[PDB]
């Protein structure tokens, strides 16, 4: 089960030049090319090592895609401007996201395109890619723009077709990375609060892909509440990590058990003190 | 690879 | 971004299937039309196609192919009112966001009565 | 409908002249494009926008402006012979993209 998800940002930067603009490409949790309006190539760029084979007529096609997004950005960042009556002097931000997710046997499962503007939802392809999805009656005029130009259809036309064939292309051209497991190194540790309550912290790290569950039960049963767990991390080496942790009364430190849940595991683990 | 239907709102 | 297309001129006689094609080299158009000019005048719409398939306006077929990268207009049932010069025009991504309009070199019809 | 003036027009080799091109459409890409036997069609500038304009395939010799969302002139400094054509004005409602809207076209003779 897999992905190819392109996310788009642009940030304005009233009174000092051209809006900052920054694309990047992932496949699944795997970052392989980039693009910085910042930097000095002004190329796509490549950030995976099974990417570099592509030759000059890809990259140029990247960068004069890539290009393209940046442009419609800038001029979609005025519009926006005018339809919700804003002046001149803030600083605001474009975010556009879009990708195709694959089944088991590498066929089309879904397709998105989302757009959102100062960090809220602006409009977004809907579940079937034939309609949009209208957050507003300033996104109502956006809407009807792209309905009467018919873009729902091409870039379902995409989303469907080119999408799939090219991630198709990226897990076969690197299947020694991208369809790797990496199983949850898991752990567990125990601290101290004030002679009284105790903390139990199920670790895991070094897995991939970054999907993971962890739940803790209580007497066979979970406990929702009363838990602290954080958001997975990058170690920084094409691997996560995450930890969730509970308070427990001195003393049945030992009732508690954490379920470790990923696809690179044969078994759903279980985990006690 | 990305697309190509890139339109302005 | 080049499209090469028979200049003409193709001389049917009434009822003929005319066929008319390009073919083009660039991966990257998107749009792709069918003008038909007639002497001394500006070119106007005929077929309008952003997909892949077959389109149909009646006495009109717009094929693309974008494997053989190949497009084809087909008038059935030659009239003599379709005696012109049929352009077609493909247009692809720029990157100031601009989709440049670009066509072939036109092909004559005139169909004999 | 796209409208060009004028449609025809005759001038010795120096003077000035300029076509002006217009449309009441709302649409906010227009271009310029020459027509001469078996070159074809030929972009010489075009505007995606009020204010924005850019050179094309065939732009030297030829200026344009886009002051006004609905007209874009095009301008010959010093007229050229090898400039006798037909020009024709096209408008998009956006981008460049989807279908194109031609002018009626302006034929133009430049003479020694």
């Known amino acids: 089960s897999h992905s190819m998800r392109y996310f788009f940002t642009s940030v304005s930067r009233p009174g000092r030049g051209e809006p900052r603009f920054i694309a990047v490409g992932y496949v699944d949790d795997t970052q392989f090319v980039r693009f910085d309006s910042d930097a000095a190539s002004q190329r796509m760029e490549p950030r995976a090592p099974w990417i570099e084979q592509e030759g000059p007529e890809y990259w140029d096609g990247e960068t004069r895609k890539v290009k393209a997004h940046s442009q419609t950005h800038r001029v979609d960042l005025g519009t926006l401007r005018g339809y919700y009556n804003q002046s001149e002097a803030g600083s605001h931000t474009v975010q556009r996201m879009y990708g195709c997710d694959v089944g088991s046997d590498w066929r089309f499962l879904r397709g998105y395109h989302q757009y959102a503007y100062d960090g809220k939802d602006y409009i977004a392809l809907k579940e079937d890619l034939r309609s949009w999805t209208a957050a507003d009656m300033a996104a109502q005029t956006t809407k009807h723009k792209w309905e009467a130009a018919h873009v729902a259809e091409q870039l379902r036309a995409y989303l469907e077709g080119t999408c799939v064939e090219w991630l198709r292309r990226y897990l076969e051209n690197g299947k020694e990375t991208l369809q790797r497991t990496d199983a949850p190194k898991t752990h567990m540790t125990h601290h101290a609060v004030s002679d009284h309550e105790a903390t139990l912290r199920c670790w895991a790290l070094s897995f991939y892909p970054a999907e993971i569950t962890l739940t803790w039960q209580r007497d066979g049963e979970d406990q929702t509440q009363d838990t602290e767990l954080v958001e997975t991390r990058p170690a920084g080496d094409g691997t996560f990590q995450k930890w969730a942790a509970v308070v427990v009364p001195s003393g049945q430190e030992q009732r508690y058990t954490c379920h470790v849940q990923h696809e690179g595991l044969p078994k759903p683990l279980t985990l006690r003190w | 690879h990305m697309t190509e239907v890139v339109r302005h709102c | 971004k080049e499209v090469e297309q028979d200049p003409g001129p193709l001389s049917v006689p009434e009822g003929a299937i005319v066929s008319l094609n390009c073919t083009y080299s660039?991966?990257?158009?998107?749009?792709f039309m069918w003008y038909r000019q007639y002497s001394r005048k500006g070119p106007e719409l005929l077929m309008y196609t952003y997909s892949s398939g077959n389109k149909e306006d009646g006495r009109f077929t717009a094929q693309v192919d974008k494997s053989s990268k190949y497009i084809s207009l087909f008038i059935r049932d030659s009239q003599p009112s379709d005696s012109a010069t049929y352009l077609c025009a493909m247009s692809g991504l720029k990157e100031d966001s601009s989709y440049k309009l670009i066509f072939g070199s036109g092909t004559r019809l005139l169909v004999r009565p | 409908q796209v409208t060009q003036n004028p449609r025809y027009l005759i001038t010795v080799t120096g003077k000035k002249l300029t076509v002006t091109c217009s449309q009441n459409?709302?649409?906010?890409?227009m271009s310029w494009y020459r027509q001469d036997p078996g070159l074809g069609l030929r972009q010489i500038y075009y505007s995606m926008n009020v204010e924005v304009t850019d050179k094309g395939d065939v732009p030297e010799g030829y200026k344009v402006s886009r002051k006004e969302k609905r007209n874009f002139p095009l301008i010959l400094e010093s007229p050229s012979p090898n400039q006798t054509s037909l020009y024709f004005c096209?408008?998009?409602?956006?981008?460049?993209?989807?279908?194109?809207?031609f002018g009626p076209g302006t034929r133009l003779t430049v003479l020694e």
């Open positions: 459409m709302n649409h906010e890409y």
């Open positions: 096209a408008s998009s409602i956006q981008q460049g993209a989807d279908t194109q809207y």
């Open positions: 660039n991966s990257a158009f998107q749009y």
